[PDB]
Amino acid sequence: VLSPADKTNVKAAWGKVGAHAGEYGAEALERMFLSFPTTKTYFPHFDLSHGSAQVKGHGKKVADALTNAVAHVDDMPNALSALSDLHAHKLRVDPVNFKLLSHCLLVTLAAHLPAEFTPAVHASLDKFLASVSTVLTSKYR
Amino acid sequence: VLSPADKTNVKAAWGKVGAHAGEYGAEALERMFLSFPTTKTYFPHFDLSHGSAQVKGHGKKVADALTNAVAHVDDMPNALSALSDLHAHKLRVDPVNFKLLSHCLLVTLAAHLPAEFTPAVHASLDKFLASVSTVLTSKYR
Amino acid sequence: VHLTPEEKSAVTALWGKVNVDEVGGEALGRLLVVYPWTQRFFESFGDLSTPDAVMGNPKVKAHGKKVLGAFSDGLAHLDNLKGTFATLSELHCDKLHVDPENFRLLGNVLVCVLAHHFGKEFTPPVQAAYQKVVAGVANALAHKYH
Amino acid sequence: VHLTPEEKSAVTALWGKVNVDEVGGEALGRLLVVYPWTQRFFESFGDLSTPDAVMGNPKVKAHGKKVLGAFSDGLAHLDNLKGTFATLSELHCDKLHVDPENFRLLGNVLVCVLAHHFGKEFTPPVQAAYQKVVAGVANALAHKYH
Ligand code: HEM
Ligand code: HEM
Ligand code: HEM
Ligand code: HEM
């Protein structure tokens, strides 16, 4: 479960992200695409190039969902319901991929937040991303 | 979540298993250790030969916990609380190991249930074992 | 795939009893029921709304038969899995866009069908040699992704 | 591993700026705090009561310097991770009883420590080469298990 200290470390860390959210999202998507090439099978007709306008667009939609989840840490399932229905019924992305994206978001945050990415903080963030991933696949079957 | 059909299909299957539960728990363990040998690192001072009395004794314990979980399918977290504390604070088995035992418990039942191991029943058992593995690791952090 | 001499013999013996057309429809049919997100690549197939609709759909059956006929060819070239599956690897990557996790899951669904189909003869030691086969076939199918 | 002429060069130039003793102390303590069940092998290390105590524990740092030197040592044999880690692979199975998943988690916590320690210099492409290295070292360490 996420605890009070988790929820505190997460809000403070995502809060520092702020308006760079969109930028961080696209880098996390690029770190993914490059370190784990099998994830590209889900974006067959995307322009996957460094600086692609399509990747920038999608990272912003991704960062924004995480913003809403942070702001509703106390009830992510209600918070992300249009989003879990869409992933379970249309997109249908395999569950192994959300671990790959989660890692890449932590690596992106570690590289941008020197002072805020302490040991206990890194630990709360890994726990919140796993929690977000479980909710997104909770209606799969 | 387990659907009304899932619940109905698991009890029907587990009831068919009936008194062979302990033996099937021992057979799944042996299927486990010969197929994915890294799992043996958790039983270093055990005699793991075929028919060993330590494997037989552990199969029984494992199978009793599942029967218990089958009787409280709508109340798993409570049902399995003492075992979730034991795995989380002492044994500390890596979570990737639980997919390996779950897969080997489905092969074991399919090998012994010609008529009851239907495609709808296979589906149900696979969701159920995954939920019992999520309760068991729920307190790891 | 290092299979022991004793493992190879066993894999081939079991394999001589498999009706590829019937086991292939069953394995792809169970993939679509047990992991329903896998139905994403079959929107033109019609009814896949229930276990019975997936199991009896003539398109599921016809597809299972071609998928397993190719897999059967791998079992005949166990020391060269990567070259026997290279064309199919380039096809699942560049043209059909299929995540290779899909092969590891069908592989594991296969193991369960063989256990079901054969009973007691699918012993702990035979399972382990099949597990070596399924992982090698899936590693070979993912080999040309990029 | 699988690295291109260009991946090899990105990795070696970054390693040249690493103080083996500090990063090793830093990555092992992060392992012990993000995935606490990993604490099962070091109950004689004293105080492991809070992230601050695990990180500060002198035995925590000793052990960390010890594992990071054997890893550091391995970067000189990128074309043969397997044979350079065999003896330690045998020792981690047979004498120490350590599940290999622990090597992969360590590998992946280390990538986080590299990103933290280096910042923007740990780019998308450099992360990519390091991902092949850590998965290459975990796989060689899991190699001799049986
Ligand atoms: C933390 C995890 C994730 C979050 C927050 C997330 C969020 C989103 C959002 C907000 C959308 C847009 C929906 C719309 O237009 O209405 C979306 C769509 C999509 N997602 Fe997810 N996603 C996650 C994980 C994944 C993963 C792991 C993959 C595959 C590796 C993925 C693949 C896709 C694709 C392909 C689309 C549609 C994109 C397009 O074709 O325009 N998602 N996701
Ligand atoms: C469905 C999953 C599982 C269930 C229901 C389960 C249940 C149990 C039970 C009932 C016990 C006995 C406690 C006692 O001594 O009274 C036990 C102990 C133990 N379990 Fe788990 N377990 C599961 C998964 C695993 C896995 C995947 C591993 C690691 C490969 C594991 C490793 C152990 C070990 C090492 C012990 C102590 C053995 C002994 O000294 O007898 N368990 N578990
Ligand atoms: C044992 C592993 C597999 C083997 C050997 C294999 C083989 C094949 C073959 C031989 C084709 C025919 C292509 C052509 O000429 O156009 C094919 C097509 C296809 N495969 Fe695979 N397959 C495997 C696993 C999978 C899985 C697990 C999925 C998805 C869940 C998948 C999805 C598809 C799709 C969507 C097509 C194109 C079908 C069509 O024409 O409607 N395959 N596969
Ligand atoms: C993946 C990179 C790793 C490398 C290269 C590595 C290497 C080593 C080396 C050189 C030793 C000393 C052997 C001797 O001369 O006796 C050692 C010991 C040990 N390692 Fe590893 N190790 C790694 C990861 C791990 C991890 C992740 C764990 C557990 C979480 C672990 C558990 C141990 C233990 C318990 C010892 C014995 C310590 C003692 O005697 O106090 N190792 N390892």
PDB file of N, CA and C in Angstrom, chain B residues 47-117:
ATOM      1  N   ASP B  47      16.534 -31.732   1.504  1.00  0.00           N
ATOM      2  CA  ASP B  47      16.771 -32.909   0.672  1.00  0.00           C
ATOM      3  C   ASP B  47      15.659 -32.726  -0.417  1.00  0.00           C
ATOM      4  N   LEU B  48      15.954 -32.508  -1.666  1.00  0.00           N
ATOM      5  CA  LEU B  48      15.008 -32.314  -2.730  1.00  0.00           C
ATOM      6  C   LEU B  48      14.911 -33.514  -3.661  1.00  0.00           C
ATOM      7  N   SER B  49      15.293 -34.698  -3.227  1.00  0.00           N
ATOM      8  CA  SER B  49      15.241 -35.837  -4.179  1.00  0.00           C
ATOM      9  C   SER B  49      13.789 -36.138  -4.430  1.00  0.00           C
ATOM     10  N   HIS B  50      13.448 -36.887  -5.426  1.00  0.00           N
ATOM     11  CA  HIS B  50      12.083 -37.245  -5.754  1.00  0.00           C
ATOM     12  C   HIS B  50      11.513 -38.030  -4.580  1.00  0.00           C
ATOM     13  N   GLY B  51      10.351 -37.747  -3.982  1.00  0.00           N
ATOM     14  CA  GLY B  51       9.878 -38.570  -2.874  1.00  0.00           C
ATOM     15  C   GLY B  51      10.387 -38.226  -1.482  1.00  0.00           C
ATOM     16  N   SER B  52      11.205 -37.166  -1.421  1.00  0.00           N
ATOM     17  CA  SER B  52      11.740 -36.726  -0.133  1.00  0.00           C
ATOM     18  C   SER B  52      10.546 -36.318   0.753  1.00  0.00           C
ATOM     19  N   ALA B  53      10.812 -36.611   2.026  1.00  0.00           N
ATOM     20  CA  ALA B  53       9.905 -36.324   3.120  1.00  0.00           C
ATOM     21  C   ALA B  53       9.877 -34.849   3.406  1.00  0.00           C
ATOM     22  N   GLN B  54      10.830 -34.026   3.056  1.00  0.00           N
ATOM     23  CA  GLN B  54      10.754 -32.596   3.337  1.00  0.00           C
ATOM     24  C   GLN B  54       9.902 -31.985   2.219  1.00  0.00           C
ATOM     25  N   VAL B  55      10.049 -32.486   0.967  1.00  0.00           N
ATOM     26  CA  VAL B  55       9.177 -31.938  -0.088  1.00  0.00           C
ATOM     27  C   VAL B  55       7.699 -32.315   0.117  1.00  0.00           C
ATOM     28  N   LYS B  56       7.443 -33.536   0.573  1.00  0.00           N
ATOM     29  CA  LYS B  56       6.106 -34.035   0.829  1.00  0.00           C
ATOM     30  C   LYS B  56       5.495 -33.152   1.933  1.00  0.00           C
ATOM     31  N   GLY B  57       6.191 -32.906   3.013  1.00  0.00           N
ATOM     32  CA  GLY B  57       5.700 -32.126   4.142  1.00  0.00           C
ATOM     33  C   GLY B  57       5.407 -30.700   3.712  1.00  0.00           C
ATOM     34  N   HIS B  58       6.224 -30.098   2.864  1.00  0.00           N
ATOM     35  CA  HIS B  58       5.981 -28.721   2.401  1.00  0.00           C
ATOM     36  C   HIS B  58       4.846 -28.720   1.377  1.00  0.00           C
ATOM     37  N   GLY B  59       4.707 -29.765   0.573  1.00  0.00           N
ATOM     38  CA  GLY B  59       3.578 -29.752  -0.417  1.00  0.00           C
ATOM     39  C   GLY B  59       2.218 -29.585   0.349  1.00  0.00           C
ATOM     40  N   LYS B  60       2.045 -30.384   1.388  1.00  0.00           N
ATOM     41  CA  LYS B  60       0.867 -30.400   2.225  1.00  0.00           C
ATOM     42  C   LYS B  60       0.525 -29.017   2.824  1.00  0.00           C
ATOM     43  N   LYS B  61       1.591 -28.394   3.340  1.00  0.00           N
ATOM     44  CA  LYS B  61       1.413 -27.070   3.922  1.00  0.00           C
ATOM     45  C   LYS B  61       0.933 -26.126   2.805  1.00  0.00           C
ATOM     46  N   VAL B  62       1.628 -26.106   1.693  1.00  0.00           N
ATOM     47  CA  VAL B  62       1.235 -25.262   0.585  1.00  0.00           C
ATOM     48  C   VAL B  62      -0.229 -25.533   0.219  1.00  0.00           C
ATOM     49  N   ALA B  63      -0.598 -26.791  -0.031  1.00  0.00           N
ATOM     50  CA  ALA B  63      -1.957 -27.097  -0.431  1.00  0.00           C
ATOM     51  C   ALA B  63      -3.004 -26.715   0.631  1.00  0.00           C
ATOM     52  N   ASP B  64      -2.646 -26.848   1.931  1.00  0.00           N
ATOM     53  CA  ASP B  64      -3.644 -26.443   2.899  1.00  0.00           C
ATOM     54  C   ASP B  64      -3.922 -24.942   2.755  1.00  0.00           C
ATOM     55  N   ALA B  65      -2.918 -24.097   2.554  1.00  0.00           N
ATOM     56  CA  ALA B  65      -3.116 -22.654   2.440  1.00  0.00           C
ATOM     57  C   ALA B  65      -4.019 -22.260   1.259  1.00  0.00           C
ATOM     58  N   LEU B  66      -3.887 -23.001   0.168  1.00  0.00           N
ATOM     59  CA  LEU B  66      -4.741 -22.740  -1.000  1.00  0.00           C
ATOM     60  C   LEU B  66      -6.181 -23.147  -0.705  1.00  0.00           C
ATOM     61  N   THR B  67      -6.460 -24.299  -0.112  1.00  0.00           N
ATOM     62  CA  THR B  67      -7.812 -24.752   0.275  1.00  0.00           C
ATOM     63  C   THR B  67      -8.453 -23.681   1.185  1.00  0.00           C
ATOM     64  N   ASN B  68      -7.554 -23.184   2.039  1.00  0.00           N
ATOM     65  CA  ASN B  68      -8.050 -22.125   2.947  1.00  0.00           C
ATOM     66  C   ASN B  68      -8.414 -20.925   2.088  1.00  0.00           C
ATOM     67  N   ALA B  69      -7.494 -20.624   1.146  1.00  0.00           N
ATOM     68  CA  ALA B  69      -7.847 -19.446   0.316  1.00  0.00           C
ATOM     69  C   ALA B  69      -9.115 -19.739  -0.513  1.00  0.00           C
ATOM     70  N   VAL B  70      -9.254 -21.008  -0.957  1.00  0.00           N
ATOM     71  CA  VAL B  70     -10.447 -21.285  -1.768  1.00  0.00           C
ATOM     72  C   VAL B  70     -11.703 -21.087  -0.877  1.00  0.00           C
ATOM     73  N   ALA B  71     -11.694 -21.478   0.389  1.00  0.00           N
ATOM     74  CA  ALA B  71     -12.859 -21.302   1.264  1.00  0.00           C
ATOM     75  C   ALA B  71     -13.122 -19.831   1.546  1.00  0.00           C
ATOM     76  N   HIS B  72     -12.207 -18.906   1.381  1.00  0.00           N
ATOM     77  CA  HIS B  72     -12.455 -17.504   1.707  1.00  0.00           C
ATOM     78  C   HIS B  72     -12.058 -16.608   0.546  1.00  0.00           C
ATOM     79  N   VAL B  73     -12.474 -17.007  -0.637  1.00  0.00           N
ATOM     80  CA  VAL B  73     -12.231 -16.341  -1.885  1.00  0.00           C
ATOM     81  C   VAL B  73     -12.663 -14.880  -1.877  1.00  0.00           C
ATOM     82  N   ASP B  74     -13.703 -14.514  -1.156  1.00  0.00           N
ATOM     83  CA  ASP B  74     -14.156 -13.145  -1.027  1.00  0.00           C
ATOM     84  C   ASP B  74     -13.476 -12.451   0.161  1.00  0.00           C
ATOM     85  N   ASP B  75     -12.522 -13.097   0.829  1.00  0.00           N
ATOM     86  CA  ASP B  75     -11.826 -12.478   1.971  1.00  0.00           C
ATOM     87  C   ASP B  75     -10.368 -12.908   2.086  1.00  0.00           C
ATOM     88  N   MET B  76      -9.621 -12.998   1.002  1.00  0.00           N
ATOM     89  CA  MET B  76      -8.249 -13.439   0.926  1.00  0.00           C
ATOM     90  C   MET B  76      -7.181 -12.772   1.780  1.00  0.00           C
ATOM     91  N   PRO B  77      -7.111 -11.432   1.754  1.00  0.00           N
ATOM     92  CA  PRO B  77      -6.140 -10.695   2.542  1.00  0.00           C
ATOM     93  C   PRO B  77      -6.217 -11.108   4.007  1.00  0.00           C
ATOM     94  N   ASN B  78      -7.450 -11.185   4.543  1.00  0.00           N
ATOM     95  CA  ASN B  78      -7.595 -11.602   5.935  1.00  0.00           C
ATOM     96  C   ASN B  78      -7.210 -13.070   6.083  1.00  0.00           C
ATOM     97  N   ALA B  79      -7.814 -13.873   5.202  1.00  0.00           N
ATOM     98  CA  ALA B  79      -7.533 -15.285   5.281  1.00  0.00           C
ATOM     99  C   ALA B  79      -6.044 -15.622   5.371  1.00  0.00           C
ATOM    100  N   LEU B  80      -5.237 -14.980   4.542  1.00  0.00           N
ATOM    101  CA  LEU B  80      -3.810 -15.331   4.423  1.00  0.00           C
ATOM    102  C   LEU B  80      -2.836 -14.406   5.157  1.00  0.00           C
ATOM    103  N   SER B  81      -3.276 -13.612   6.104  1.00  0.00           N
ATOM    104  CA  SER B  81      -2.535 -12.622   6.854  1.00  0.00           C
ATOM    105  C   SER B  81      -1.261 -13.018   7.558  1.00  0.00           C
ATOM    106  N   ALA B  82      -1.291 -14.139   8.247  1.00  0.00           N
ATOM    107  CA  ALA B  82      -0.122 -14.672   8.953  1.00  0.00           C
ATOM    108  C   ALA B  82       0.926 -15.131   7.949  1.00  0.00           C
ATOM    109  N   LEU B  83       0.511 -15.738   6.842  1.00  0.00           N
ATOM    110  CA  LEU B  83       1.474 -16.155   5.796  1.00  0.00           C
ATOM    111  C   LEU B  83       1.982 -14.884   5.043  1.00  0.00           C
ATOM    112  N   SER B  84       1.175 -13.863   4.891  1.00  0.00           N
ATOM    113  CA  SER B  84       1.733 -12.698   4.234  1.00  0.00           C
ATOM    114  C   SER B  84       2.780 -12.079   5.196  1.00  0.00           C
ATOM    115  N   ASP B  85       2.555 -12.055   6.514  1.00  0.00           N
ATOM    116  CA  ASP B  85       3.606 -11.502   7.418  1.00  0.00           C
ATOM    117  C   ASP B  85       4.856 -12.435   7.349  1.00  0.00           C
ATOM    118  N   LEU B  86       4.706 -13.765   7.426  1.00  0.00           N
ATOM    119  CA  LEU B  86       5.837 -14.644   7.387  1.00  0.00           C
ATOM    120  C   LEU B  86       6.715 -14.455   6.142  1.00  0.00           C
ATOM    121  N   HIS B  87       6.121 -14.396   4.950  1.00  0.00           N
ATOM    122  CA  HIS B  87       6.880 -14.226   3.714  1.00  0.00           C
ATOM    123  C   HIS B  87       7.516 -12.853   3.684  1.00  0.00           C
ATOM    124  N   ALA B  88       6.779 -11.797   4.054  1.00  0.00           N
ATOM    125  CA  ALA B  88       7.368 -10.457   4.080  1.00  0.00           C
ATOM    126  C   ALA B  88       8.456 -10.145   5.098  1.00  0.00           C
ATOM    127  N   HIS B  89       8.443 -10.754   6.295  1.00  0.00           N
ATOM    128  CA  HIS B  89       9.492 -10.394   7.262  1.00  0.00           C
ATOM    129  C   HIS B  89      10.570 -11.439   7.509  1.00  0.00           C
ATOM    130  N   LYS B  90      10.373 -12.717   7.196  1.00  0.00           N
ATOM    131  CA  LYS B  90      11.395 -13.695   7.443  1.00  0.00           C
ATOM    132  C   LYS B  90      11.919 -14.320   6.126  1.00  0.00           C
ATOM    133  N   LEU B  91      11.066 -15.145   5.519  1.00  0.00           N
ATOM    134  CA  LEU B  91      11.452 -15.835   4.286  1.00  0.00           C
ATOM    135  C   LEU B  91      11.941 -14.893   3.178  1.00  0.00           C
ATOM    136  N   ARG B  92      11.226 -13.839   2.916  1.00  0.00           N
ATOM    137  CA  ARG B  92      11.581 -12.793   1.933  1.00  0.00           C
ATOM    138  C   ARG B  92      11.928 -13.245   0.538  1.00  0.00           C
ATOM    139  N   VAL B  93      11.138 -14.179   0.000  1.00  0.00           N
ATOM    140  CA  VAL B  93      11.279 -14.756  -1.335  1.00  0.00           C
ATOM    141  C   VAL B  93      11.038 -13.752  -2.439  1.00  0.00           C
ATOM    142  N   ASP B  94      11.943 -13.652  -3.423  1.00  0.00           N
ATOM    143  CA  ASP B  94      11.672 -12.605  -4.454  1.00  0.00           C
ATOM    144  C   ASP B  94      10.327 -12.785  -5.149  1.00  0.00           C
ATOM    145  N   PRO B  95       9.485 -11.767  -5.329  1.00  0.00           N
ATOM    146  CA  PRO B  95       8.220 -11.858  -5.998  1.00  0.00           C
ATOM    147  C   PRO B  95       8.187 -12.542  -7.363  1.00  0.00           C
ATOM    148  N   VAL B  96       9.257 -12.554  -8.118  1.00  0.00           N
ATOM    149  CA  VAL B  96       9.196 -13.212  -9.457  1.00  0.00           C
ATOM    150  C   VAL B  96       9.023 -14.718  -9.249  1.00  0.00           C
ATOM    151  N   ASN B  97       9.278 -15.237  -8.025  1.00  0.00           N
ATOM    152  CA  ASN B  97       9.192 -16.680  -7.821  1.00  0.00           C
ATOM    153  C   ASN B  97       7.760 -17.221  -7.791  1.00  0.00           C
ATOM    154  N   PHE B  98       6.849 -16.363  -7.407  1.00  0.00           N
ATOM    155  CA  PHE B  98       5.444 -16.758  -7.244  1.00  0.00           C
ATOM    156  C   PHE B  98       4.838 -17.033  -8.623  1.00  0.00           C
ATOM    157  N   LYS B  99       5.191 -16.411  -9.722  1.00  0.00           N
ATOM    158  CA  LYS B  99       4.675 -16.757 -11.087  1.00  0.00           C
ATOM    159  C   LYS B  99       5.090 -18.154 -11.505  1.00  0.00           C
ATOM    160  N   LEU B 100       6.284 -18.572 -11.091  1.00  0.00           N
ATOM    161  CA  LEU B 100       6.884 -19.886 -11.374  1.00  0.00           C
ATOM    162  C   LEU B 100       6.137 -20.989 -10.618  1.00  0.00           C
ATOM    163  N   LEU B 101       5.842 -20.821  -9.312  1.00  0.00           N
ATOM    164  CA  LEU B 101       5.045 -21.820  -8.604  1.00  0.00           C
ATOM    165  C   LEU B 101       3.609 -21.842  -9.185  1.00  0.00           C
ATOM    166  N   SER B 102       3.011 -20.688  -9.439  1.00  0.00           N
ATOM    167  CA  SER B 102       1.625 -20.611  -9.986  1.00  0.00           C
ATOM    168  C   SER B 102       1.589 -21.333 -11.326  1.00  0.00           C
ATOM    169  N   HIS B 103       2.417 -21.049 -12.289  1.00  0.00           N
ATOM    170  CA  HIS B 103       2.468 -21.770 -13.536  1.00  0.00           C
ATOM    171  C   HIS B 103       2.597 -23.287 -13.336  1.00  0.00           C
ATOM    172  N   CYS B 104       3.476 -23.768 -12.457  1.00  0.00           N
ATOM    173  CA  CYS B 104       3.632 -25.181 -12.156  1.00  0.00           C
ATOM    174  C   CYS B 104       2.456 -25.834 -11.399  1.00  0.00           C
ATOM    175  N   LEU B 105       1.620 -25.079 -10.671  1.00  0.00           N
ATOM    176  CA  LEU B 105       0.399 -25.573 -10.081  1.00  0.00           C
ATOM    177  C   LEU B 105      -0.682 -25.717 -11.211  1.00  0.00           C
ATOM    178  N   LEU B 106      -0.743 -24.877 -12.226  1.00  0.00           N
ATOM    179  CA  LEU B 106      -1.701 -25.075 -13.348  1.00  0.00           C
ATOM    180  C   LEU B 106      -1.318 -26.299 -14.187  1.00  0.00           C
ATOM    181  N   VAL B 107      -0.017 -26.515 -14.450  1.00  0.00           N
ATOM    182  CA  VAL B 107       0.419 -27.703 -15.226  1.00  0.00           C
ATOM    183  C   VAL B 107       0.033 -28.958 -14.463  1.00  0.00           C
ATOM    184  N   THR B 108       0.256 -29.001 -13.157  1.00  0.00           N
ATOM    185  CA  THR B 108      -0.059 -30.119 -12.273  1.00  0.00           C
ATOM    186  C   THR B 108      -1.580 -30.417 -12.323  1.00  0.00           C
ATOM    187  N   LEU B 109      -2.402 -29.387 -12.132  1.00  0.00           N
ATOM    188  CA  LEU B 109      -3.861 -29.689 -12.206  1.00  0.00           C
ATOM    189  C   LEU B 109      -4.208 -30.125 -13.633  1.00  0.00           C
ATOM    190  N   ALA B 110      -3.690 -29.444 -14.705  1.00  0.00           N
ATOM    191  CA  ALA B 110      -4.066 -29.902 -16.050  1.00  0.00           C
ATOM    192  C   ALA B 110      -3.636 -31.357 -16.260  1.00  0.00           C
ATOM    193  N   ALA B 111      -2.567 -31.807 -15.636  1.00  0.00           N
ATOM    194  CA  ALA B 111      -2.138 -33.167 -15.894  1.00  0.00           C
ATOM    195  C   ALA B 111      -3.109 -34.137 -15.218  1.00  0.00           C
ATOM    196  N   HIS B 112      -3.888 -33.758 -14.244  1.00  0.00           N
ATOM    197  CA  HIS B 112      -4.749 -34.670 -13.468  1.00  0.00           C
ATOM    198  C   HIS B 112      -6.257 -34.415 -13.693  1.00  0.00           C
ATOM    199  N   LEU B 113      -6.722 -33.407 -14.439  1.00  0.00           N
ATOM    200  CA  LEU B 113      -8.106 -33.063 -14.686  1.00  0.00           C
ATOM    201  C   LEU B 113      -8.563 -32.942 -16.178  1.00  0.00           C
ATOM    202  N   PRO B 114      -8.570 -34.077 -16.856  1.00  0.00           N
ATOM    203  CA  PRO B 114      -8.967 -34.213 -18.244  1.00  0.00           C
ATOM    204  C   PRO B 114     -10.295 -33.534 -18.599  1.00  0.00           C
ATOM    205  N   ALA B 115     -11.335 -33.834 -17.801  1.00  0.00           N
ATOM    206  CA  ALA B 115     -12.615 -33.164 -18.110  1.00  0.00           C
ATOM    207  C   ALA B 115     -12.784 -31.806 -17.459  1.00  0.00           C
ATOM    208  N   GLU B 116     -12.286 -31.582 -16.236  1.00  0.00           N
ATOM    209  CA  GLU B 116     -12.541 -30.280 -15.614  1.00  0.00           C
ATOM    210  C   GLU B 116     -11.564 -29.195 -16.079  1.00  0.00           C
ATOM    211  N   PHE B 117     -10.461 -29.542 -16.752  1.00  0.00           N
ATOM    212  CA  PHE B 117      -9.547 -28.439 -17.158  1.00  0.00           C
ATOM    213  C   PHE B 117      -9.851 -27.797 -18.496  1.00  0.00           C
TER     214      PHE B 117
END
